[PDB]
Amino acid sequence: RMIPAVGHFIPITSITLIYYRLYLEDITFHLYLVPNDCTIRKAIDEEELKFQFVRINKPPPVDALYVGSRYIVSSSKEVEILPKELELCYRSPRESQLFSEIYVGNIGSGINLQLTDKKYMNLIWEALLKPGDL
Amino acid sequence: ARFCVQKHSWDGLRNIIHGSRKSSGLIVSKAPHDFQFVQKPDESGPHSHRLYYLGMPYGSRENSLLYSEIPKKVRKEALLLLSWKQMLDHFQATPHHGVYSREEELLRERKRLGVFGITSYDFHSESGLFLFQASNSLFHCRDGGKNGFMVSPMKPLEIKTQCSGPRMDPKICPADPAFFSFINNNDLWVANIETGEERRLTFCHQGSASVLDNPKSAGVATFVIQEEFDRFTGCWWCPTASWLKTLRILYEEVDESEVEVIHVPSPALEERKTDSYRYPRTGSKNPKIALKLAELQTDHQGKIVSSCEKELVQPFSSLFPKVEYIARAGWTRDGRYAWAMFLDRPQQRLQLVLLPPALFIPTLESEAQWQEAARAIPKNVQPFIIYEEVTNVWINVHDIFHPFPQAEGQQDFCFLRANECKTGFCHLYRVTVDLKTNDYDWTEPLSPAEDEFKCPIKEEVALTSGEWEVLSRHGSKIWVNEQTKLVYFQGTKDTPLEHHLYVVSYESAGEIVRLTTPGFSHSCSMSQNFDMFVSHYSSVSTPPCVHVYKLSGPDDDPLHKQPRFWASMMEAASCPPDYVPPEIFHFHTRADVQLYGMIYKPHTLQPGRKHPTVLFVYGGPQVQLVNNSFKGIKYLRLNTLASLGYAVVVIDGRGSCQRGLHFEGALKNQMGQVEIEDQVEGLQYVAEKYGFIDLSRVAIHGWSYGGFLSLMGLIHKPQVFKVAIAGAPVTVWMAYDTGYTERYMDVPENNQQGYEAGSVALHVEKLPNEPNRLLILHGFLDENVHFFHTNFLVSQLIRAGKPYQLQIYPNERHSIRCRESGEHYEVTLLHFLQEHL
Amino acid sequence: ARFCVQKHSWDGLRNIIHGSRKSSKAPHDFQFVQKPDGPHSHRLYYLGMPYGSRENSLLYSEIPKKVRKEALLLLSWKQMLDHFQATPFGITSYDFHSESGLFLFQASNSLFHCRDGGKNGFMVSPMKPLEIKTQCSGPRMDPKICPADPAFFSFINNNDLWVANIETGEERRLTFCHQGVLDNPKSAGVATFVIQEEFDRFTGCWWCPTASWLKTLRILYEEVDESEVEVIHVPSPALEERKTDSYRYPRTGSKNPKIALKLAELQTDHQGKIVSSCEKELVQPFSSLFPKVEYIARAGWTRDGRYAWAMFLDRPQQRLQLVLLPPALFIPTLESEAQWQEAARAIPKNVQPFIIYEEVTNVWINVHDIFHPFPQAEGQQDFCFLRANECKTGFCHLYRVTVDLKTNDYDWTEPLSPAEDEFKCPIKEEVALTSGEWEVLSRHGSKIWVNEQTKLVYFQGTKDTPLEHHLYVVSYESAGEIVRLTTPGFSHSCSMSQNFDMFVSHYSSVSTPPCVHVYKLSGPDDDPLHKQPRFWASMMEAASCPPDYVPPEIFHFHTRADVQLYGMIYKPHTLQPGRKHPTVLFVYGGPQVQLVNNSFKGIKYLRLNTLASLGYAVVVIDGRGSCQRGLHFEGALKNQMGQVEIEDQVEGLQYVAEKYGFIDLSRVAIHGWSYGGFLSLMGLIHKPQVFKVAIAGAPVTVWMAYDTGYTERYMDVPENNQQGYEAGSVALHVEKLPNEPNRLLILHGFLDENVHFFHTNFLVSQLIRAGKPYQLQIYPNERHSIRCRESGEHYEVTLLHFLQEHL
């Protein structure tokens, strides 16, 4: 008999990468939620560059998130998210890299983009995308 | 005059617990595990040793194999912090998404491994061969010897197979590293590594995939053995090859036909299905066991030519009556004998027995051929009961045993043995015994008497003595150096609150020499060459650090070799922002018995005040709560309790370990009735010494024995304890297994008086009538103490009308594993005290 | 201003509840037997326990002839079984053969039988019941007397049909489906779990009422093959063993067992010894003769035996169709492909199955047992019967319909693939006997009685008001006018006599306990319809509940969409004006059950009155979804179980706040059991600002884990309704529950077999992942309903205390 041991868990840092491509005027965004590391950025950069996508720098979440959380992607109604949720989890670099794509016809005055904690409804991130970044 | 704890919202409590865990101070989550030291030829480089171990360097949440080079002639003024080199290039060893098969997850629950990845491994020194299980199967690699030491990580080679289930418990044959063994589908298998061929040697499991229909098993430890005796294997290699090359394997075959079965929910809740276990409750029948050999012969190219399997020339139950368990078993280093440790049912007579391989004959059903095998056995072949330990309290089982390879002295057999029932304390003894023979007639069956194979003692020399004991359980071992006639061990000679390393000459029992610095508690592991050792130590006010020391000094006097600090593998952290380390104290009782303890005095204290207290308690045997080790990461919730204004009082009353036998032997047949008096006596003392203890508002809180003790306090001492938060309690004692209840409580046929007053569910009418004075917590999937215990208690509360509250953890076994169940456990814990205390 | 309930200790609440229960069963099913003279005129048998040994026993009573009017009469309760025990409560049921006057029942370990008529002697003293000695192993289940022969009877042993004889004591096993738990999935003549629970059918065998020509006797049973049905595990009542039991539980989306109908013939002689005992089957596979047939709702024979009939249902439960099977279509099971092809051709040509009446709806089909086949003349062309259609006009009404039996002379040797209208017979006439925005009670043991000598049908309906059950009568030869036979202002549960001259009425009202009164019809012979009932005697009288009970008050209102709803409210004891009392919204809100009706509630829900004596108001309203109100009203739940019912609760709860004044909308709880628990949780999620706390009892948390018969009927099996499933499962919306503690209690029985403990187990498992708090109360020894009294008291005490503190 031994006293049961309560598990210890620490949140980790993470970043959110914004990618875009412009065809004629329609924008396709690619949003990546990934733990803050070195190799993953210089890999995903090439993976997106293959399809002529490019990066746009926006601040990562300040708070330290737990690994294994689910986040609703929310916006103003004029957007189309083929995956509506994102998931923070480690990923083997030589394997596939998940993301969420967003289709918008014309940005105009800029579109909002928010991640939101599924369990508690926390606004842990935001981004005011503008045509200036394009 | 009193002090009232601040009232927080539920989300507020969640936030403060999240913050207290975020401020943990970036713990390593694992210290370097079991090490292996490998010398290097000096001309090969600047280093002198290579050190292999397990660990996670905070990079991944995956335990992995690492190594480090031990430098030569390190300079003194500057601290050297060794690296952690990877050995398997980018090889993840946890299964996909971290979900294990039921066999290995149950084994992890039995070993209490809360880490992912390679948990253990097997290592052959000469060939330098590493063999382990990773992902869902076996892997192996080579770094030590002829391959030459590596510089860059290399790829592990998967061992191809054709079996169906998981390959459990790999073991490398010492006599030949070209083979290995394992357990598959509850049977035994031997395989080759080079040729890739396999072979099955046991035919006990039908494979009908239904625990109910195929009861037999071969070379595997049952439940009661794994849980209550901590033996996780059933097979053992003979370390010498006998001359075609013949190899032996001692293994046990269990027969669980008549063992009572129970059903336990499965981790897949949607199925609403249960798994069946052979769970022998107190008073029931334990499985039937036996010991068998399994020979196999090979040629120069490594092909298994023949593969027999033998048995004792008499039924195992006939030669050895009154034997209920097989605690430990193994060989000697020459291969001349195989040994085992037998426990009787009341667990009061353990005995070492020595068995020659010649007593194993092939399984001959033709009675004519069998009487020929029983005729061909040599004369001097018979079992030898070298040692027997009879007590009056109970026999704690030790692994400490070291036989000396005997020269051509046919009579004598010398060995060290950590005996504990002789003086009341665990002490090493050097005993030499003459193996007397009788030249039995195995053709005619024999009904052995009580002293058939007992050989008489020639000498019995104590090597250590005093009011202290030698560490012998929970994975503690001794290292014997036969080139200098020394023995390295660990004990509590200095103070019962510290574990230190020692050495003493086993030829001449002189004076003991401590090798570690005082003021800490050390867990250390020697080298096989006895020139270096690594120690893992900490104290109440300092987190752990892992240093490596080098035994230097004149070669003529080896006892007084001074331990030189060579390098470090991990440093302390000191957890500065919000952790006030507790303060150890000690008092005496009215029966003149010294007890220890510790108190977490409240943060931001003021004179002339009173704080609500929380008497944290385990109280059960084989656990010591108060010792000079760092409680900062194990029990930090108690610090958070203190951070709010509660005064936590821990106390190791009579019944705990590390203080001898007669001290622990106070629970015998009175379990439950005596441990609370020590908690209340040690709680009233702190009211005198310190003044901030508010005896008006006293809680109590425990887990799986303290949960049982939380309820006994509220029954016996309702005026002392206002609330009581029991966790996974043990309500009725007639529904717990044999290996533990019989040891302390003497099956209900004999102790029906004590079983009555100890089972807390049979006294439900003495619990408080008022509401909000009892919380109950239990895990649904629990298989150590099942949900029945809480479920039967609730049933008894309703037959009497007493109020209660309850929290169930559906996806949690006996230990809370996921973080969401941990947070919710603490968040609801603070909230109960915040409102009802 | 506001009002605050007086706080008590735990002992206080327990003591007031013990007192309330300290200050608190009518005769069961009856049968009439004429007594040929004598002082009396009939003898009436029933089941009951008179103020003594707690045991439902057989009690008879002599109805006297020419009773006087000036004084009320109270019949005695005679006994029939001298000092017999029927508890493993009491004799739960029995079967009665009128001609020989033989009662056969199962008492708690074995079968017993007795006789009161035929021998020209009616018993005077309670006699000894005789034991039917058996050589079987387990318990005999579901005995039935053979209407063609009062010597032989049938029963079920280990899922296999058996036939025994009373005079000779010999037995015989007719079917061998059980290999003798999971290894054997085949059963013979038993109703499975879904049939017994969700379709209200508790038998698998059906005797033929007429013997044919040694004398042969037919028995129509069904065979079920549960091979590929899922298995679940439920704890055993003996907690100490820590072992579970296995049941076949086909969850929604899974596959129901495979059904098949089979006769079972047997022949005997003048001495009652069985000579032959065969077993037969359809000339074509059941799966091929009738594709798209999922369940067998009901079955039986006609009056003369010339046909066996059954009611078939498909998986969507939107096509119920009557079928009529002749015994000549069942050939013995023949292994040799030669003997099969000669018997497949040796049957007559006109013999075939007929689809007598196909009911096609758009909502669902409620299984009515109301169907009366008329024995006709040679009459080979036509066939007439009475059927209680409901999908025709949206209400359950009676119909007389005559259909002609067209024949095509199939070649039963060659394999056939039937088309959409293979055996559909064309209708000849269809006249509605009843009409209007009411319905004829058809389910829950409610039946009709058809008198053929006087051409009258007696039925129960709610023609006056949806709150009452009355006994009506109308002529089936001519759709004339209906006549109510029960006194208004009550709700009755009548049972006619086999001679159509008397009827007992067990009736009660909101403010009056149940009383059993026997009425004898006396009227002109020339007009049978206008015969008027005369009160004759009272078997039992109402207690009147005098000292502590106060009956609630029924009201009704209209919603925003102009849909009339009903409701009821227990007014708080000792009410002062300008006082806002704390209320409780007790709710069920599910289909097949209504709660607001003019019947005595003071025995089923007196805790609602105990809640009122403290100072709580109670509000019960039956919104859209309940029964006894048509189909388009009940059919508002379709594919939206959860999303509609709670909207009407607040719509009605607000109404009570204006009609009365003592409703404190700040303090209002919500409480229900097994569908109110589902709705309580759906209220606390949708209306947190409306409801302070919730008390969910045994709730259904996820719909993907419930059986097919109930869920697929209302929720459109998951593949086609993946929107309404996730939006109706409360365990998938846990992130919307309250964060504050002391706002959610959860109770559940551990041994629950209808809605398993997994539902609250999974819910708790989702409350932890979201961080929300809760409380919990487990009843380890209680199934779906809290039976024992300790578990019942400890439930109401903790219900008062959770309201005392956190409301």
Numbering used by the authors:
A (entry chain B): 976 to 1109
B (entry chain D): 21 to 263, 269 to 862
C (entry chain C): 21 to 44, 50 to 62, 65 to 115, 136 to 227, 231 to 263, 269 to 862
Can you list sentences taken from the study reporting this PDB entry?
Nucleotide-binding domain, leucine-rich repeat receptors (NLRs) mediate innate immunity by forming inflammasomes. Activation of the NLR protein NLRP1 requires autocleavage within its function-to-find domain (FIIND). In resting cells, the dipeptidyl peptidases DPP8 and DPP9 interact with the FIIND of NLRP1 and suppress spontaneous NLRP1 activation; however, the mechanisms through which this occurs remain unknown. Here we present structural and biochemical evidence that full-length rat NLRP1 (rNLRP1) and rat DPP9 (rDPP9) form a 2:1 complex that contains an autoinhibited rNLRP1 molecule and an active UPA–CARD fragment of rNLRP1.
